[PDB]
Chains A and B, each alone.
Chain A
Amino acid sequence: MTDRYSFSLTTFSPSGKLGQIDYALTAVKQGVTSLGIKATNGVVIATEKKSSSPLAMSETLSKVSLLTPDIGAVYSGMGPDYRVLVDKSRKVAHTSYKRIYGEYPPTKLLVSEVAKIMQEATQSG
């Protein structure tokens, strides 16, 4: 066994494109529309609950997720990838911030931590 894929699966093509990132963006494009609007006294995020079947309970599938008491997230693209990112985003808000400073991270820094996780999947083996 062992993870014998210790090399990058995303690489620069001759034209300077990172194929797997472009293709990931293509998958996002196919995804259901979600949006965000910032007001003076608040922010709103919204999306369509595209129900795969009418027998399915769309309330159980939460596209909009609480990350911290003052931070929320919504997505477009592959749902399972989002779900695990939300779990990692929640945990990293505690391990790399709340357990150090005794308070929740500011929006920009939590975003930065999420961005780091996504960057690593773009370069790691």
Chain B
Amino acid sequence: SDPSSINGGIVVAMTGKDCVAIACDLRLGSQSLGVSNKFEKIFHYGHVFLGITGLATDVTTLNEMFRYKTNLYKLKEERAIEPETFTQLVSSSLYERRFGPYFVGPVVAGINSKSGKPFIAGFDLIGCIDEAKDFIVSGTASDQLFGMCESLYEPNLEPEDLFETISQALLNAADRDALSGWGAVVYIIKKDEVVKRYLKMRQD
């Protein structure tokens, strides 16, 4: 019935020293029924990364939409979009559907190519921006993620330390949520290299 918790799934993003990290589970379901263990919720447009939880049809639709818009942006601007700008685009795009919204919980993550500054942001389904320094959480285990992130997180973590923190935050949260899990992916993002790691976790 509740659109934001039909398909299930989670996204978490964290900042570190000269780096950001964004991670997600791989589950897609029809309520109790597990349907897919390969449904990735993190996408990227140039160097800007976008996680999207919520209703899976909208996750797909919005990815296709932001690919569309960032591609036209790049052709006209003659440069790749930045995280701060993209965040505003995501906010605008969601709010234009104010009285018929996409049932999603987007999460932006990336590093500004000019300043080198790590950036993360989160949104509600209607476009309200949450620009936190520390971390952003989203999905059906957002409460669990808030609890994990609040205790495990410390500022200025190195890329390889940050990986451990965000991974353990995701995994242990997803294990306390029926509609999340079935695999997980973690992106470690630096100014000019990005490492993508699939995590091993319990398959139920």
Contact = CB atoms under 8 A, between A and B. Distances in A.
A101 interface: yes
Contacts, number: 18
Given A100-B89, A101-B85, A103-B88, 6 more contacts: A99-B92, A100-B92, A101-B88, A102-B88, A102-B92, A109-B76
Interface in A62-90: none
Contacts of B91: 102
Nearest to A102: B88
B88 A106 contact: no
Nearest to B96: A100
Interface of B is mostly: helix
Interface string B67-84: 000000000110000000
Contacts of A101: 85, 88-89, 92
Interface of A is mostly: helix
Interface in A8-49: none
Interface of B: 76-77, 85, 88-89, 91-92
Interface residues of A, number: 8
Interface string A91-125: 00000000111110010010010000000000000
A102 B89 CA distance: 8
Contacts of B88: 100-103
Kindly list the 6 A-B residue pairs having the minimum CB-CB distance in the complex, ordered from nearest. Answer: A102-B88, A100-B92, A101-B88, A101-B85, A101-B89, A109-B76
A63 B143 CA distance: 58
18 contacts: A99-B92, A100-B88, A100-B89, A100-B92, A101-B85, A101-B88, A101-B89, A101-B92, A102-B85, A102-B88, A102-B91, A102-B92, A103-B85, A103-B88, A106-B77, A109-B76, A109-B77, A112-B76
Nearest to A109: B76
A9 to B, nearest CB: 30
A99 B127 CA distance: 13
B127 to A, nearest CB: 11
Contacts of B92: 99-102
